[PDB]
């Protein structure tokens, strides 16, 4: 009975600012903003998400939660894409980008309520972004000299692991540093030539024990049974290793070549052919000095018997990625054919052995003197699968962060635990006060948006924000007997948890953040906030 006027596009979902959609989008984004607010900070917490396969997923990474959660509203999709960009380009700071964008939208809601046009809000946000990016250059306190030493690497590794696995940062940082040191080349003070790759370090886990029992391997590790009578090779140096893709069996043509034994004549003929061909191929391979053969497919009975006869290590690697890693480690080239031990294609591995870790035996291909491997493997031990998964995620994040120590602000260090955030708040507030026109309100709101980080740290640690926030403001806003600020200007946000007053200085625990990470996160968050705010109407067509 109620007439409908003003609608002409379609009865499908459609939103316009005439009904306040500019605030409805922000409210919708808040649903996942609250979700991600509980992840940032050293005292972050994971969440339980059920996969489509009926499995249970528990992780502290907000990006993983977003991936495992259904995204419907385009406004949320914008932030999801921004977070994906942050993860791909930088490898860390997804929580920073998400929370900053959410807070920027929240303050934009207040600005809209005040009556400020979205155009002025966007202009002020852009100006504040430029000011903050320029100021971050002067906020640097320390810097990584790129000595590639474990002690210097830990300085950056430790903060990265924190907020991903709380309480175990000390051991995880040592493990990451040990793994990185095995692959870094002999070089120092060189940020223009890449040396470290994210894939250079592999992470594996073995059930049983605790994190304290974890170790690091100086080469490739295979977690599959060799399926043969040869378990390990001697300690002789420079073992020749042959890599094959065709299964170790009778060699046949590319087309057809199937062997079928139907009757006595065919049985005898095919048995003789298979035995002779396999024996000849194995003898030829052994004569070249090949002590280990790795095949991407299975191994036949006669193949196993002849491999045992010549004492050739037996191993199958159905995973092509593992084959590529082995080839990179030893330099061997995959052989599509059988019985072709070409020296130019055979690799060299100094030591090949089977090692038992926690009751599980694995095969390790490591280099000692020659053909030094550029890859390392991390083995995690623990009786809890959730803890192992969290540790694996933390190790991956640390490995990704380590790759970011290059010239473009990789080594530059900022005071973490919100100290940089408070300094930026003060500077942006001063700039907005200096900035004339309506842009001052937007600059002040952009500054206020940065107050979340200390608030999140205080809340996740169980501290009373009503006391921590004024204490932080006083600590970062002090009056000294002179024209230049002095004393402890690097006070951060402490978690305590047992007993403490105020906050602790950053230098006490050396909690520093990468300049490049923070700068790129701020840029991406501001871009996402501007993109979301710039949409005042959504029109879609029914499928």
């Amino acid at each position: 009975q109620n007439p409908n006027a003003g609608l002409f596009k379609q009865g499908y979902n459609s939103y316009s600012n005439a009904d306040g959609q500019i605030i409805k989008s922000i409210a919708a984004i808040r649903e996942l903003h609250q979700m991600c607010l509980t992840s940032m900070g050293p005292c972050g917490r994971n969440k339980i998400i059920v996969n489509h396969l009926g499995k249970i997923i528990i992780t502290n990474d907000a990006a993983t939660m977003l991936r495992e959660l259904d995204i419907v509203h385009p406004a949320v999709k914008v932030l999801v894409m921004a977070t994906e960009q942050q993860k791909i380009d930088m490898g860390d700071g997804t929580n920073l980008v998400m929370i900053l964008a959410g807070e920027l939208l929240n303050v934009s809601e207040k600005l809209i309520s005040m009556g400020l046009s979205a155009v002025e809000i966007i202009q002020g946000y852009n100006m504040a972004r430029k000011f903050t990016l320029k100021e971050l250059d002067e906020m640097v306190v320390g810097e990584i000299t790129d000595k590639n030493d474990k002690n210097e690497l830990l300085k950056m590794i430790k903060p990265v692991i924190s907020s991903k696995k709380y309480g175990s940062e000390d051991i995880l940082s040592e493990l990451v540093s040990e793994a990185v040191s095995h692959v870094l080349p002999v070089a120092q003070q060189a940020g223009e030539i890449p040396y470290f790759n994210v894939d250079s370090i592999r992470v594996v886990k073995i059930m049983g024990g605790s994190l304290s029992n974890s170790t690091v391997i100086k080469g490739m590790v295979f977690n599959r049974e060799p399926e043969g009578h040869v378990k390990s090779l001697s300690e002789d140096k420079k073992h020749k290793v042959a890599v094959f893709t065709c299964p170790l069996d009778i060699a046949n043509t590319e087309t057809k070549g199937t062997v079928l034994l139907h009757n006595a004549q065919e049985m005898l003929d095919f048995s003789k052919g298979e035995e002779k061909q396999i024996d000849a191929m194995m003898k030829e391979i052994a004569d070249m000095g090949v002590e280990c053969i790795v095949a991407g497919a299975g191994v036949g009975e006669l193949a196993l018997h002849y491999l045992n006869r010549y004492g050739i290590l037996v191993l199958k690697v159905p995973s092509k990625f593992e084959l590529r890693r082995l080839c990179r480690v030893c330099g061997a080239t995959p052989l599509p054919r059988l019985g072709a031990p070409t020296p130019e294609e055979l690799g060299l591995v100094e030591t090949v052995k089977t090692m038992e870790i926690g009751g599980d035996r694995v095969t390790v291909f490591k280099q000692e003197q020659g053909e030094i491997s550029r890859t390392s493997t991390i083995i995690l031990r623990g009786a809890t699968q959730n803890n192992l998964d969290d540790i694996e995620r933390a190790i991956d994040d640390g490995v990704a962060a380590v790759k970011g120590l290059m010239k473009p602000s990789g080594g530059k260090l900022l005071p973490g635990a919100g100290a940089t955030e408070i300094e930026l708040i003060s500077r942006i507030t001063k700039y907005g006060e200096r900035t004339p026109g309506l842009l001052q309100l937007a600059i002040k709101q952009f500054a206020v948006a940065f107050e979340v980080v200390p608030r999140t740290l205080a809340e996740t640690a169980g501290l009373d924000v009503n006391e921590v926030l004024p204490n932080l403001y006083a600590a970062h806003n002090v009056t000294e007997p002179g024209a230049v600020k002095t004393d402890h200007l690097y006070k951060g946000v402490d978690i305590d948890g047992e007993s403490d007053e105020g906050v602790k200085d950053i230098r006490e625990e050396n909690i520093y953040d990468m300049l490049a990470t923070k700068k790129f996160a701020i840029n991406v968050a501001t871009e996402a906030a501007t993109t979301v705010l710039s949409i005042d109407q959504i029109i879609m067509a029914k499928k």
């Binding site: 003003g6 385009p74 999709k77 046009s117 155009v119 993109t531 710039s534 949409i535 109407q537």
Partner: protein, 534 residues
């Protein structure tokens, strides 16, 4: 008066429906006018989010239920093949003109008189446009005016920050692609590329072409200077039969004998290829050699080329081959048997770009490429689409301006001046009719929609800035000098478009006015709606 089981609309219902649809479309597209406009998100059921401000994209990719709105959108979008811009202007003009016509009809004015007044006002506006245009200089060194035009066309589609990067690229591409001769302009020689690796702010101008298919070898040259271009159409890779087949051996001798059949032709071609490479640039310093090899290349020949410091590409596109021939000047060799040094071309710096998911080869720095390439970069699909749309719009606008020396100053001066001239001329001449004055005033008021929408999108009140602009126009007309008065969407006060650098296309405005007048006249003449055909 109706047949059983029939649907029809009589009385003023048709007028109400048409006015409602026009107002709805006008409100939908109002916020997309001017550099301060908003962005709309479109999802065509696939769930992909696309952001754009172009009127054609908004109208064509959005579902419209009202039949009148469908026709209005189609008519507005049809201008893309005539001028390439002004769709939103056409829609806003149609909406406001229909609103004014309905307002006058409520007073008893017949639609036919309104249509006649619209025609008279259209003729007067054409005369005003003729008397108001400025003849742009044809000097090829006017890079400043081209940059101003590109900035004006781009600011409507970008966030006002990527302008500083995109404007120079588009302006330089359009200036270079036009030969130093009368001839004509053809944007088909300007290629646009999209890459998902870097941010949109990293976009740059490419002087030549980029090749996607290349060889792979650790020793392949990375940078080549003063390189000769050789295009070859004969395969340089091992080939097998259509049915799966291969060579099987049981000994080294059999291996070599069977591989001889595969490698014979490759070695025969490589012999003459290397002979040619030695003949030209074999010992000449500060020179390079690049071979296209449109056909595929096997790893053995790639290694052979690498050991000879030859940048070898494979599986090149036919279109890219033709563009190389037109750019580098090299010819395509059907068979190496007739290989000769005359086939060799010449090119400047040749280098490869390595990306995580792909690789590219640059053949830029040619003596006379007679072509340009623009590389678009981004991290998201919507950003890339917006950048592509903006680049295409800027290219078309600059090309049209170069083709047509007539330029109309922007900043809202044109519409305000047109309205004032229409009002004054029709009040003085009184040559159409007393009642037609209703339609004349309707057209005059409707033509002010564009500046009002531009002011509204910028957050300023039209009632003040438009009044100030009117006062400045009166002062200028009283003065003996010629001056253009517009609206500054950034400061809020009045400004001179000819000094700030805001311009509008003559053809865009002319065609937009004509289309808006035609659509309004056609729609106002609809009296009843009849349903038939099912």
């Amino acid at each position: 008066l109706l047949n059983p089981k029939a649907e029809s609309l009589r009385r003023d219902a048709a007028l109400k429906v048409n006015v409602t649809s026009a107002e709805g479309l006008q409100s939908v597209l109002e916020t997309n006018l001017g550099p301060k406009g908003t962005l709309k998100m479109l999802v065509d059921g696939a769930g992909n989010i696309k952001l754009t401000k172009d009127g054609k994209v908004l109208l064509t990719e959005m579902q419209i239920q009202s039949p009148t709105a469908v026709l209005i959108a189609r008519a507005a979008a049809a201008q893309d093949e005539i001028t390439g811009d002004g769709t939103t202007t056409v829609v806003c003009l149609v909406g406001e003109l229909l609103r004014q016509a309905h307002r006058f009809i409520q007073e008893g004015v017949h639609p036919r008189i309104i249509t006649d007044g619209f025609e008279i006002a259209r003729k007067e506006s054409m005369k005003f446009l003729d008397e108001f245009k400025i003849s742009k200089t044809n000097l090829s060194n006017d890079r400043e005016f081209l940059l101003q035009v590109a900035r004006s066309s781009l600011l409507t589609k970008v966030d006002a920050d990527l302008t500083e990067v995109l404007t120079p690229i588009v302006t330089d591409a359009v200036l270079s692609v036009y030969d130093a001769q009368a001839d004509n302009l053809d944007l088909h020689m300007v290629e646009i590329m999209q890459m998902q690796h870097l941010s949109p702010k990293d976009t740059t101008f490419i002087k030549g072409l980029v090749l996607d298919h290349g060889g792979r070898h650790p020793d392949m040259p990375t940078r080549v200077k003063n390189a000769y271009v050789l295009i070859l159409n004969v395969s340089l890779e091992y080939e097998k039969t259509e049915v799966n087949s291969g060579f099987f051996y049981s000994s080294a001798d059999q291996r070599d004998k069977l591989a001889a059949s595969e490698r014979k032709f490759v070695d025969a071609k490589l012999k003459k290829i290397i002979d040619l490479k030695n003949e030209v640039c074999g010992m000449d310093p500060d020179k390079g050699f690049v071979i296209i090899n449109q056909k595929g290349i096997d790893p053995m020949s790639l290694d052979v080329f690498a050991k000879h410091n030859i940048l070898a590409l494979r599986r090149a596109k036919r279109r890219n081959m033709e563009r190389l021939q037109l750019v580098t000047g090299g010819e395509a060799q059907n068979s190496v048997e007739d290989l000769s040094p005359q086939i060799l071309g010449f090119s400047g710096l040749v280098y490869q770009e390595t990306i995580g998911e792909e690789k590219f080869t640059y053949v830029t720095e040619n003596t006379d490429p007679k072509s340009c390439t623009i590389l678009i970069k981004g991290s998201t699909h919507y950003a890339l689409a917006q950048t592509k749309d903006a680049v295409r719009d800027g290219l078309r606008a600059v090309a049209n301006v170069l083709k047509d020396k007539n330029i109309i100053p922007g900043a809202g001066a044109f519409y305000i001046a047109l309205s004032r001239y229409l009002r004054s001329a029709n009040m003085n001449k009184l040559g159409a009719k007393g009642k037609t004055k209703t339609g004349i005033e309707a057209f005059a008021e409707a033509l002010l929609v564009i500046p009002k929408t531009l002011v509204k999108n910028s957050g300023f009140d039209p009632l003040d800035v438009l009044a100030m602009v009117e006062d400045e126009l009166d002062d200028a007309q009283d003065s003996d000098e010629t001056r253009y008065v517009g609206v500054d969407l950034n400061i809020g006060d009045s400004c001179d478009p000819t000094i700030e650098g805001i311009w509008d296309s003559y053809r865009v405005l002319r065609n937009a006015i004509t289309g808006a007048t035609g659509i309004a006249s056609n729609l106002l003449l609809c009296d009843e709606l009849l349903r038939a055909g099912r």
